[PDB]
Design a binder for this molecule. Structure first.
Ligand code: HEM
Length: 414
């Protein structure tokens, strides 16, 4: 393919500036499974010399379905850390369900599923709609400001707190810990240590589990720590690892779907007018496909496996570029058109179908719908002031800041 020598699709220096949309398109056309070599020292923590870049949706689905071959546990799913990360800090990811394989994954996923039933998630609708309205109103009253802080950040965190029944007076500290826990290489956050925040959150969660076992209630935490008919339940530490997992899994991801959904609405005012008018049930999925908050997750082959004519060898990493797959011209009609009516929309922003497919997908869609309803109600005319500031990460597609005029009336500053 026509790519610069040395090009690495996991390079956080790319994403601090842009999404490499042209280069993904070049691989889908010229080399849809492509060996991305990595130089000595520059492996993002993996010392294997490179990985297979997976760029087509059908191949992302195939890998995702064949979890008996393509393991999450062996090297975890994050394809990029600081280059000098210790191996034990990659392996500590195995304590959370996202980085487990069957059969251990299968048991935990069945228990954790109790928290994500339609009823469990449905129960959060009213508090989240009230909060979404309050968020948007307060931002509108500020006139202008950082959309990421003032509109995108809070609701995903309130969804996690509501789910876990975190007392109101504990939410600031919970959110503080959570916001320190999705590591990145961004110089703006170079002073933060995820490990200490993670240990505080796990201890807080374990105390909650102990208390709820003693005073069970009609809530999701009680369901998780009480034995079902098969005797299965989360131990206290397992409950702590579930909370730690959510603090990353359901935080920056939904946050970025909100920021980048609004960026797409600013870029496509026809879609924003359509949205405000009809508030269509298909909008959240198009927002997720367009935002693709997780650029990529990886797997490791547990045996040689041929994928679309390419021999993957045992031990090699494959990196599923959801950012590429979600724009695959053989699966979507006009993938580079932002269309909030798109249906079907077989995007992989929540992963390919398979064991690990996002268990929070419906909660995330509800979050997105409630906050955009509130934005439509309170700041229908909002206009950006300056360009988004992207996050330096080689796997998360993040926006740190985006200055916006909620009134739409401020004139151009010179
Ligand atoms: C738009 C927002 C979101 C996006 C783009 C997203 C994306 C993803 C992706 C790509 C995966 C891995 C899928 C795979 O490997 O096949 C995943 C897993 C997961 N997500 Fe989400 N997610 C979002 C919101 C949420 C929310 C709101 C929560 C919970 C509050 C959540 C909880 C989880 C959990 C617990 C896993 C692990 C599932 C497993 O390993 O079995 N996610 N998510």
């Amino acid at each position: 393919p026509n790519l610069p020598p040395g090009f690495d699709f996991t390079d956080p220096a790319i994403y601090a500036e842009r999404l490499p949309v042209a280069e993904f398109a070049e691989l889908r056309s010229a080399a849809p499974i492509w060996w991305n070599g990595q130089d000595p020292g520059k492996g993002g923590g993996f010392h294997d010399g490179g990985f297979w870049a997976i760029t087509k949706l059908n191949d992302v689905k195939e890998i995702s379905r064949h979890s008996d071959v393509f393991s999450s546990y062996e090297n975890g799913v994050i394809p990029r850390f600081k280059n000098d990360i210790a191996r034990e800090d990659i392996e500590v990811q195995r304590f959370v369900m996202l980085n487990m394989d069957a059969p251990h994954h299968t048991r935990l996923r069945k228990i954790i599923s109790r928290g994500f039933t339609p009823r469990a998630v449905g129960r959060l609708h009213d508090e989240l709609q009230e909060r979404a309205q309050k968020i948007a109103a307060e931002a509108a009253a500020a006139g202008s400001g950082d959309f990421v802080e003032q509109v995108s950040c809070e609701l995903p965190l309130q969804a996690i707190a509501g789910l876990l029944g975190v007392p109101q007076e504990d939410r600031g500290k919970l959110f503080h810990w959570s916001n320190e826990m999705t590591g990145n290489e961004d110089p703006e956050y170079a002073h933060i240590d995820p490990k200490a925040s993670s240990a505080e959150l796990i201890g807080y969660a374990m105390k909650m589990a102990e208390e709820k076992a003693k005073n069970p209630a009609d809530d999701i935490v009680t369901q998780l720590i009480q034995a079902d008919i098969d005797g299965e339940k989360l131990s206290d530490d397992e409950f702590g690892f579930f909370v730690v997992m959510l603090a990353v899994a359901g935080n920056e991801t939904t946050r970025n779907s909100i920021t980048q959904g609004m960026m797409a609405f600013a870029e496509h005012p026809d879609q924003w007018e359509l949205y405000k008018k009809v508030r269509p049930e298909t909008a959240a999925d198009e927002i997720v496909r367009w935002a693709t908050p997780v650029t990529a997750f990886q797997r490791t082959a547990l045996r040689d496996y041929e994928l679309s004519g390419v021999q993957i060898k045992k031990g090699q990493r494959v990196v599923m570029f959801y950012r590429s797959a979600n724009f695959d011209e053989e699966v979507f009609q006009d993938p580079f058109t932002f269309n909030i009516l798109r249906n079907p929309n077989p995007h992989v922003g929540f992963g390919g179908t398979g064991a690990h497919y996002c268990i929070g997908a419906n909660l995330a869609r509800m979050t997105i719908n409630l906050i955009f309803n509130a934005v439509a109600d309170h700041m229908p005319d909002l206009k950006p002031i300056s360009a988004p500031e992207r996050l330096r990460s080689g796997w998360l597609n993040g926006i740190k800041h985006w200055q916006v005029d909620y009134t739409g009336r401020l004139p151009v500053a010179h």
